[PDB]
Design a protein around this ligand. Sequence first.
Ligand SMILES: [Mg+2]
Ligand SMILES: [Mg+2]
Ligand SMILES: [Mg+2]
Ligand SMILES: [Mg+2]
Ligand SMILES: [Mg+2]
Ligand SMILES: [Mg+2]
Ligand SMILES: [Mg+2]
Lengths: 117, 127, 82, 98, 200, 146, 60
Amino acid sequence: ARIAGVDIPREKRVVISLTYIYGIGTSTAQKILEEANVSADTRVKDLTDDELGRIREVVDGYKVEGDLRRETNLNIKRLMEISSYRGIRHRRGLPVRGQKTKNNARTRKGPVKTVAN
Amino acid sequence: QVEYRGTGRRKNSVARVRLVPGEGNITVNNRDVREYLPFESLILDLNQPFDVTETGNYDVLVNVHGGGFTGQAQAIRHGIARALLEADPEYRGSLKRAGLLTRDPRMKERKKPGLKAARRSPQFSKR
Amino acid sequence: SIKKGPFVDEHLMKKVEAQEGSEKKQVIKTWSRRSTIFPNFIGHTFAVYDGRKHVPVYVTEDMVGHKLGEFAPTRTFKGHVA
Amino acid sequence: KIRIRLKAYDHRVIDQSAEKIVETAKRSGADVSGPIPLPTEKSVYTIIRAVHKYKDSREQFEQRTHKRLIDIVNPTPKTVDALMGLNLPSGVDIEIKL
Amino acid sequence: GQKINPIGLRVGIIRDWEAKWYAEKDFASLLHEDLKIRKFIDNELEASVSHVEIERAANRINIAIHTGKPGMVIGGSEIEKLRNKLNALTDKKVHINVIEIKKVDLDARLVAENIARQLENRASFRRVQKQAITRAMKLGAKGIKTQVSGRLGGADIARAEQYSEGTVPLHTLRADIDYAHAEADTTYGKLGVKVWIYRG
Amino acid sequence: VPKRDVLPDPIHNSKLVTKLINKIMLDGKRGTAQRILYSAFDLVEQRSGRDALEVFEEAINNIMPVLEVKARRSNYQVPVEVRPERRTTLGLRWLVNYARLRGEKTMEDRLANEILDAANNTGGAVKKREDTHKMAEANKAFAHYR
Amino acid sequence: KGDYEALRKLPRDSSPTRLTRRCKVTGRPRGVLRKFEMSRIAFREHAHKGQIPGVKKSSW
RNA sequence: AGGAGGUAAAAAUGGUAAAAA
RNA sequence: GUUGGGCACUCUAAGUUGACUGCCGGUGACAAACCGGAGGAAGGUGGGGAUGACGUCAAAUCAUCAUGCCCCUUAUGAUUUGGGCUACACACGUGCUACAAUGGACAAUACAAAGGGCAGCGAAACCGCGAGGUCAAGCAAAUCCCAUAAAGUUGUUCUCAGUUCGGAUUGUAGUCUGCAACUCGACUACAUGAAGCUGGAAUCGCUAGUAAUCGUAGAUCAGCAUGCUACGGUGAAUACGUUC
Ligand SMILES: [Mg+2]
Ligand SMILES: [Mg+2]
Ligand SMILES: [Mg+2]
Ligand SMILES: [Mg+2]
Ligand SMILES: [Mg+2]
Ligand SMILES: [Mg+2]
Ligand SMILES: [Mg+2]
């Protein structure tokens, strides 16, 4: 069922359906399913209500998705106000990591603007 | 106690054959051939020498190294064929027609300079 | 990245502690862009060599662990048409 | 025992250097193991045959190394300085590992 | 252009290396100070030298000079003073031998330099090759080819004239074919000569 | 320039079951190709209640054509008769290429429905044989004499 | 500037990662193999004269 | 062998001027 | 196979035997030669390489080198530090990874050839979730090390969903080489989860151990490989006739 303030797909397995929460991937899902002693092969449809609260109790130790938005965006918003190198690359809309911008910056550049002379 | 031996080479793999009279079950590298080879279709062509000469009462013990499982099994039939000719010279004519006696000379070709493989060329451009 | 202490250049750090005796004046010239900004570096305004000239740069209390050179941009890009 | 490794660049200047050393061992009797050939160590160099352009035209160069291993047992007083005394043709070095 | 050195193909088949020594370590440094021995000889020697072949052992280097006039290299006071210069350079001991050559014009190293020094005397390029073609065929050459290329008569644009007499099979690899390219430095620039001689 | 030889399979001892393994073989991997053909015969025998080779020999003849066009020269198609080995070439190639376009979610399941369909004289690989006779019998008129 | 480039390479530098390598015959910085210490152009004319010991053309 | 009558429609353009017995 | 023995088998690399249209049949101007057949590991220049006639394109290089002539010489030569060769509205060439079920993930287990190693190759053990860290056995090589070969096979599981497909993008925390990774290195771990559902007009390579696919090694190099050069595993389909 619903856990940690987010809706969960019910038909799938627990260790896959916990990766639908922003902040939990394939490793930190199993790192809850190994300490709380819940069988990893259970369906989310077929839990009881005791094992649901046991998983839900330890999840709030890890950062929820509401925390991670203001934690990640504050790491970007302090980079722009100090006028760093990659602070202004966030403003330009260009790749941060130093990729060659001759041909492919298309994830940041977006759609194409075809001209020639 | 009489024991006929043959050597069989195919595709960077060589074989050493010791055959004893007994039940017709192949032994290779001190194991059984069920786990040693993934496909039973290979067993049909390494039992091809016993088919054409019509005999049997032969228990073969093989020792191979090098190559992969096609060349390391289709070289075993080369050793079986050259050891059955040590048992009877008259058996040669039945082995000659199928071609089990001869060795395949097909080995891997050389990567030439300028080409990505032996016979593979880079893509051509504005002509 | 380096697990060793953030990179000290012996000439740069010498004259930063030679500023905390009487007064924090506003200009020291430096050619070190590879020097990590220490927590002692704050309050002093440097002059890095952009290339053409030394450009001004101030350090606030949000610059620890950042290089001295990344605040000065070396190549300038104006718009392709505007 | 006495281990003698010959190493040269030719299969002919090392073929006579193996036989000419082994008679001098036989002059002190017997017990010298025959020449057993070791696998060669050959190295390939691939250079562009042009000067400026033309990456697709190369030329393949080769350097080979040939080996012979001779073992001698039961050393005698005459046999030591005898094989040390004779001078092999240039291009092959003796590695004596007694 | 589109032909290789015929001497360079046949090294390892029917030609021998000029250097004969094995070096497990220091093979880079023991080669480039051996490359200065043969550079030192070819400048000082005018004795017409074909081979500067080298054998090396521990503490020694053997120098088997092949030359046209052997008395110029032999001299006593001429040879040992050269040996004194060779001992000073490498700080190792050398041992020089001098080998002569009969049939001077049957060696393509010496036909190439003789033509190139006569072209600096500005003699006609068509007849410097033609005497060289005639002289070898009487001395016993089964074939000979000679080529001079460049600004031949002093012309503003370059060309190349060549001559032959007899068979010179260049695709046959068991054929022993001598070859050398020498230079003439004119006031009009450079000048390349090339001589093939096939003796059988 | 001849075709060399192919030896039969161990299970059925036939020349054109092992020739079908080569057509299903993608990327030079033979082991996956054998499982798709040896297990689809087990699925056919569950549906049909017949021998797997017996449904196979029936469905192969329902795909194999007898007379096909050829483009030569405006646009002319000339119907010629087919050699007895291009029939097995065109036959079981249509059997595998039209079985990948079935719509089921397993090629182990897609291959066992085409041999079930084509034995009952219907299907995608059978209507290709219908449209290589129909195309070759509209223009049978002009092209045989020339 | 080929004279000062071959001349600046011979003395030891302040930092031991500034140490480039060049040809010994021609003083070329690229395409030089460290076993012979000569460039790809100087390696070809020496092999074709027969002066490097034990080197031929491979045709395997 | 010789005479006679005809071809599965289509499909433009490309300054100037020299090299060398 | 580790030690006693053995050079039978394999392997190593030196020397030799062998393939020539040399026998048989037929056609052929009795000739050249073609179509078969025997023996034979191999048959019709066995497979592949190296080898590029005279000439053509005022084709490429004066920045490998060498050089006729021309220019600079208180600079167009020389020194160091920082920067740039890595920019970015776009257009093109060559590749890599994908769009999934002939698949993705987790376990167990199978078989190579080639080549490199002296202050270089780093065995084992212990430590770290991993990249790695400590201590160092042996080894100038058919010995020791790089080095578990991968695809494969046997099992469990996922169920046609932009997903348990894809791994771009960005945040944090690291490891290592180096005097020093801001412009501007490689890798790891966690979180993030972009376009992408087989590609218009046009276009490319390939005839057999080849196409396709799967790993491995070397040179350059302190550190850095989707490139280049080499090596083996699995391994097809098709040639009717033309050359319009
Ligand atoms: Mg091109
Ligand atoms: Mg460097
Ligand atoms: Mg026209
Ligand atoms: Mg031009
Ligand atoms: Mg600089
Ligand atoms: Mg995945
Ligand atoms: Mg889909």
